[PDB]
Amino acid sequence: AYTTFSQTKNDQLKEPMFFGQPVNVARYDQQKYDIFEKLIEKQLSFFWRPEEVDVSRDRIDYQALPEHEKHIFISNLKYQTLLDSIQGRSPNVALLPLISIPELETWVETWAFSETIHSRSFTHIIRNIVNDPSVVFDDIVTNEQIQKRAEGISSYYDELIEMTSYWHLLGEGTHTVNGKTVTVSLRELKKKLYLCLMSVNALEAIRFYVSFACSFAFAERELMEGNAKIIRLIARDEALHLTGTQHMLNLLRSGADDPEMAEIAEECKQECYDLFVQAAQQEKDWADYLFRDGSMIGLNKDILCQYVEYITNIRMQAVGLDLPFQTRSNPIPWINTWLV
């Protein structure tokens, strides 16, 4: 029951962000929530092309890095590649089929699009510093350390996607699928969406910021400056992406949108807290991996783990969760110089 053009005229201004009547005409003259249009406009004015970034001296710098430092850099780069590959497609397949307001529909499309520009910039980098790009790309899928986080993130999307299909196809209630009985609940589906958004918020707000830290640590040493320029542009986008999921979440839990969402948000508090905390933990185990056999000027396991906690506190707070860490200061204040 999904349609690329719903034939019944409806007032999109009195429609919920999700689960209402699929958007028919895409208009931008009216806004239910000013944030989304503000984000689309911002994102469009931020438009950049990875190919235009000069990554010439970068091969030299990378080739000169000792092995563990190449390991730190490339592992970090494979993680960013893996995250943005998922973020390029997932928000379109997962959220797009559920959105009921035009401005949000376009924001999701604009947002997912910018991720593809991000994935393109990683290729531009990888196939410019490394000898055989295929070795790096293949490892993103076979490396157990990288895949350890991959399966958790996508799992949220995949579960939402499948539960969305049963809903669209069978609708609410119990149904007979090959003799089995299957229960499709819109309430459960709304939970899946809420949790997925929470997971996506942790990815852009925490996971990606941990990676920016390693990228900029090299930049501080005046190495990999082409990469630095790309990551700084990427970060400028992540700020916008993160803000969009923050607003979506806050609007949903504040009942200002779908009142049932406000309820669901509450039943979820623990799961959210736990998923955010689990993400932070995973980022700390990553720091162990990256720094297994050494650190470099400006970064080490301690510095990164503290940064992870610092950032986690701040993000969790922004979406109404309890701060899980005592940490209260930024150990890498220079990162703000890069961040925008």
Pairing of strands 173-177, 180-184: antiparallel
Residues 6+ apart with CB under 8 A from 132: none
Does 31 participate in binding a second copy (rule CB under 8 A)? no
Which CA distances in Å does 188 have to 17, 126, 311? 17, 41, 30
Stretch that binds a second copy, among 22-30, 197-205, 299-307, 313-321 (CB under 8 A): 22-30
Through-space distance between the first and last CA atoms of the chain, rounded to whole angstroms = 42
Geometric angle at alpha carbon 220, from 214 and 225, rounded to 5°: 85
Q: Considering the complex, what minimum distance in angstroms separates the CB of residue 113 from a second copy?
A: 4
Q: What are phi and psi of 166, to 5 degrees?
A: -60, -40
Does 29 participate in binding a second copy (rule CB under 8 A)? yes
- 95-112 in b/e form (b: 16+ CB < 10 A) is bbbbbbbbbbbbbbbbbb
Angle between helices 144-170 and 133-142 (to 10 degrees): 60
Please give the residues from 284 up to 303 whose contact with Fe ion meets the rule CB under 5 A.
296
Please give the residues from 108 up to 127 whose contact with a second copy meets the rule CB under 8 A.
109-110, 112-113, 116-117, 119-120, 123-124, 126-127
Q: Considering the complex, what minimum distance in angstroms separates the CB of residue 32 from a second copy?
A: 14
Angle between helices 102-129 and 225-253 (to 10 degrees): 160
Please give the residues from 132 up to 151 whose contact with a second copy meets the rule CB under 8 A.
133-134, 137-138, 140-142, 147, 150-151
Q: Considering the complex, what minimum distance in angstroms separates the CB of residue 11 from a second copy?
A: 9
Give the nearer residue to a second copy in terms of CB position, either 29 or 67. 29
Please give the residues from 43 up to 102 whose contact with a second copy meets the rule CB under 8 A.
44-45, 47, 49, 51, 81-82, 84-86, 88-90, 92-94, 96-97
Q: DSSP E strands: which ranges in 85-221?
A: 173-177, 180-184
Q: Considering the complex, what minimum distance in angstroms separates the CB of residue 168 from a second copy?
A: 6
Q: Considering the complex, what minimum distance in angstroms separates the CB of residue 125 from Fe ion?
A: 20
Stretch that binds a second copy, among 41-49, 59-67, 225-233, 262-270 (CB under 8 A): 41-49
Find which of Fe ion, a second copy, none residue 32 binds, CB within 5 to 8 Å per kind: none
Does 65 participate in binding Fe ion (rule CB under 5 A)? no
